[PDB]
Swiss-Prot record, chains A, B, C, D:
This is Mandelate racemase. Divalent metal ions. Magnesium seems to be the preferred ion. SMART domains: MR_MLE (SM00922). The gene is mdlA. Substrate binds at E315. Changing E315Q: Reduces activity 10000-fold. Changing K164 to A/M/Q: Loss of activity. Changing H295N: Loss of activity. Gene3D superfamilies: Enolase-like C-terminal domain, Enolase-like, N-terminal domain. It comes from Pseudomonas putida. It is an enzyme of class 5 (isomerase). SUPFAM superfamilies: Enolase C-terminal domain-like (SSF51604), Enolase N-terminal domain-like (SSF54826). It holds the Pfam family MR_MLE_C. Homooctamer.
Length: 357, 357, 357, 357
């Protein structure tokens, strides 16, 4: 009944006020692929992909362009489209950039399906919109900038902030975390993210020191794929280990949770397999008793978290704000889904032209 | 926007063409609760429950009637409704009859949501309709009647049948299976169901004998809650052990799959928690690598299996045919979803009056 | 030789001085089903069921009324009656309300058997009566009322009290527990009950804080069915995790203990399967080295704990005191079994009429 | 001392004598990226990548081209280069196409290092050249063509062949294997490949049937990422389950071997991470006691298997024969490494122009 009739992609390198410094490199500009999925119903699904590094940006766009051939003239049925793509890429490897591209399609197909039915995505998934608590996500900022950004976040009504750590010395990690605590006060969350930067023994040592400071969670202390190493680190901690932004599909989540890698999860809407993958991930987090937060993609994650039985936090890190209208709002630090069909992404068409690659 | 405005239930004891004989007793007629869920949009959601024994029938209706005040004025958002009911019944025990009642509400709410959007439930879930292979489900019929029924099913185009076994002697089980096999030939499925009738050593001995006959699966060989015992039985078999019709919620499925109880699953749309529970169950079966079939509820199960990654068989056992229009049809032994909004259940209002308890 | 000759049920909604506030809802009045089991010996067995919420009250009564057909004219042999009911409800699901109703029958049958033999139940079970230490069980009361109730309990001779926690902030849980400690002094038990209200990481954080206060146990920190989550919480604690009030049958206890969910158990005489189920549960707690307390049902639990090899505490929470004579007494905070045949329940017939539903 | 000075890639779609038919689709021609790595020493390293589907071909080339700036001016030290690339792609996800691109760089860098030292790669790795038994790799060819191809291979001196199976019926798998066996005799290897086409119960049933026929190994019976499912299949078999062609890096191999997924391994030189990844994989297979074969990449795999402690078979499947000189030869079914520095890859420059995408 409704068919996909076109796929348009636009590669952009977009401005961020504050470059995302990490222990393993700076993300100084956001390389995104913006996706428009045309349909026989006239509505156009919107989504985007994050390419992490501009090195991958043109490759990701080209891959999606070539993938168009597989989906045009197929029905707008995201679950069936996903199964078809999983089969088509069985031999190549349905992971990494291929999986990310499949997820971009999925996110745009669900946005379009929401638009077909003139209903916000959360409602199409069978849930009510609810406000979801959000933390403001910062970077490897040093004491001066971490303090400045934390005061700003608290003024904006956020109740938690995340900072990136993994400086050369533990004492530097501690100094930044302690300075943020002075800026925000005691009844306020401080999440920390190591971005895979430590080995297991260093992570045990650093994390036990951070736990004495009362941090909210310790995210990706070691190499993302090392689920057994994360379990060994978690075994030495009361604070929860958080991970999941790098799980490519719910199958990788399942493997990590099966061995007790972490006590918190935070899938990325792109890497986990879009809406279809997120819903499957939510069913796993529920059974394994794991509170589930989001990673990036704040626009769609506000909808998805509202349908997630163990919903925890929304990450506010506004990578696409320069090119997407601010229809997602924050009240008392909680993300509020807009009353728009599908996801609520409206492009800033005049702005996009400035950033095209 | 769309609110629930009322709930009506009707308790019936309905005729079946053949009484369902099992090793642990006979289900001679079908005790059902038929559910109507009124909404502020003018559409009415329909579902029903199976009470198994008339002894539970009036209790189940009374419970639903007393739950009306919990759901009236709530939004028609089945995922959010399910979370609310789980919380309200946290103390009483969200299992057994209470969980079955919540599932009947869920199935009616999803039917209504499909009607609000003028779309079949399968499409609302994001999948394409597809025909699903069905097996014709029979009973503890003895050699003559089992064989007759199998021939009739083969003539109607079914490619498998299920018979119930657990006669006093193993030789009687084998005589039935052999007689069916002679009548239907080697290219035909024969599933067998023990209906929890054997202890573990008996199940190992009977199952290894049936395996030498060539059966398709061996269903519920022992007490349904004994997941470890099912695992011990499965450990002695090449043929797959099938179970799941008695799982109350996806949490019970998760416990059974976690310990290797079975190599096939067949959740019951009511006991698993309606559409909401089924979708969660489907995520679990995908990750555990378990082909997933249905139990009863053929009308909604045709939709649900179309959205299930590891969909296997639909059970054809038409409990409600006396009171529901035959909009679900079978072509070449495959169930075909009707082109109707929601589930496609239409009451036979003239017939329901005959069977009221 | 002795046959069951009648079953009478009465649904009542009975007054409690102090409504049972919990983190997940208030139990403001006690919905009970009162059971009279007539016999061919003339004696009448007495028991009752707790329905938790008035939503379930009429359904539970109706279920028991319909179950009467299965037990009238059967011998007064509770172990054989239980096996018969387990078989009769094999297909429907011998759990939830069905199991609770079966347990009400069992508790009344044993009371009647005690009366046939003119002997208190504890003696029929082969044990001597002994006083059993009891704690006074309170609710989510806030600082003022928790202090008031704790002073009263200490004046009455109880040596321990339980309070319900799970306020929005950990600091609120701590304030109440600390205030109770000022009211009762240092050589006095303070149990705490979270009523399933936390996720696993929150339970680890809160429980480690409470353990620094010296609480006696931490009860049901997370969803009752999540035995693996309880084990993960227990793994992070020196204080024992307590659970079991929600186990429906000894089979659910077995599953929880097999995976190390808890270091203490507290079966509910109704949910565990009555006297027959309690005795089986006691044999399991003995082998798994788990001290075993009771949940509610103080009248019969005084007998059952006296026959329990690992008996620990009796919960004093007098749900049925408005309708049962106070033949159970307390001396120095220990429950003292009355010298009456069977359980010692004598109805307050004049009072029951005030509360009938 | 020796630096990388440039990178050139060429994307081709090349003819194969026989299209590779599999149960999950056909690879009709070979999409390849041919890589030239220039150095300050004047030598040029050569390698290539297989893109599986033309849909990934332009994306893979674009990614390599964009990676040029990362590796130009870096020393020609493949182990250090690999560590650098792992770190640079830590966030994007060092797997899938990105990891394949890094492996193509690695293979070209090692070829160049062999040329810098005027020595075949096998000798640079510290091993002697030795002939390695090879099997001739065929496809889902049907009875007539499978049997013809097997006879031709036997005539050329190969002592084993691999056929792809997973026809719609098990009897069709068996008919193919039996026909080959009749034509080649009892002293000959017949490997079979299911190309991920079966669910676990289907794989158990089909595999136990093939085992009774006498096959050499059963390759990828189910979804490649499902290591637990492969273990369940292997647990039901005497014949070895073979897998590994889809492991992206030795970390995936380590996960699969840790849970007993298979009794044989066959890493793909590209997906495992080039020479650097292969050498790591070889260390793992030695410790886990797993005989290790190759997948594709016959030119470099002849060198690598000569340095592999548990070397088993080389797969002869000549994907690049249209564009690479036939310096690798076969004598008595054994691959013979050419006496040339590095890998021995020489481009057919006149032929490459025909096939450019
Ligand atoms: O079957 C295999 O091994 C293949 O990788 C395929 F692509 F078909 F999956 C190949 F290339 F060798 F044919
Ligand atoms: O908390 C408990 O134990 C209860 O059963 C409850 F219902 F509240 F859960 C009660 F009420 F009896 F105290
Ligand atoms: O056998 C089964 O599946 C049944 O649930 C039974 F009730 F008999 F247990 C039914 F209804 F399908 F017949
Ligand atoms: O840290 C993260 O989550 C990121 O994905 C990164 F790329 F940095 F890894 C970012 F940038 F978006 F913040
Ligand atoms: Mg992060
Ligand atoms: Mg059955
Ligand atoms: Mg309690
Ligand atoms: Mg292969």
């Amino acid at each position: 009944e409704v068919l996909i009739t076109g796929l348009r992609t636009r590669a952009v390198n977009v401005p961020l006020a504050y470059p995302v410094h990490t222990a393993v490199g700076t993300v100084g500009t956001a390389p995104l692929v913006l996706i428009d999925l045309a349909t026989s119903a006239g509505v156009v699904g919107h989504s985007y992909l994050f390419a992490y590094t501009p090195v991958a940006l043109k490759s990701l766009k080209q891959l999606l362009d070539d993938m168009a051939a597989m989906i045009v003239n197929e029905p707008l049925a995201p679950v069936s489209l996903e199964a078809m793509l999983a089969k088509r890429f069985c031999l190549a490897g349905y992971t990494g950039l291929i999986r990310m591209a499949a997820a971009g399609i999925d996110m745009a197909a669900w946005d379009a399906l929401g638009k077909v039915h003139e209903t916000p995505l959360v409602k199409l998934l069978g849930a009510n919109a609810r406000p979801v608590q959000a933390y403001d996500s910062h970077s490897l900022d040093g004491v001066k900038l971490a303090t400045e950004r934390a005061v700003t976040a608290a003024e904006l009504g956020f109740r938690a902030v995340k900072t990136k750590i993994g400086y050369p010395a533990l004492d530097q990690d501690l100094a930044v975390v302690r300075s943020i605590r002075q800026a925000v006060g005691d009844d306020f969350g401080i999440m920390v993210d190591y971005n895979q930067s430590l080995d297991v023994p260093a992570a045990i040592k650093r994390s036990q020191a951070l736990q004495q400071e009362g941090v909210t969670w310790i995210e990706e202390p070691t190499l993302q794929h090392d689920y057994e190493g994360h379990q060994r680190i978690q075994s030495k901690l009361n604070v929860p280990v958080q991970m999941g932004e790098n799980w490519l599909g719910p199958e990788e989540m399942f493997k990590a949770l099966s061995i007790g890698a972490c006590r918190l999860a935070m899938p990325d809407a792109m890497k986990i397999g879009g809406v279809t993958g997120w819903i499957r991930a939510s069913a796993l987090a529920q059974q394994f008793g794991i509170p589930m937060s989001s990673h990036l993609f704040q626009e769609i994650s506000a909808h998805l978290l509202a349908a997630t039985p163990t919903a925890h936090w929304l990450e506010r890190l506004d990578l696409a704000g320069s090119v997407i209208e601010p229809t997602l709002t924050f009240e008392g630090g909680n993300a509020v889904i807009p009353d728009l069909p599908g996801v609520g992404i409206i492009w800033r068409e005049k702005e996009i032209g400035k950033y095209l690659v």
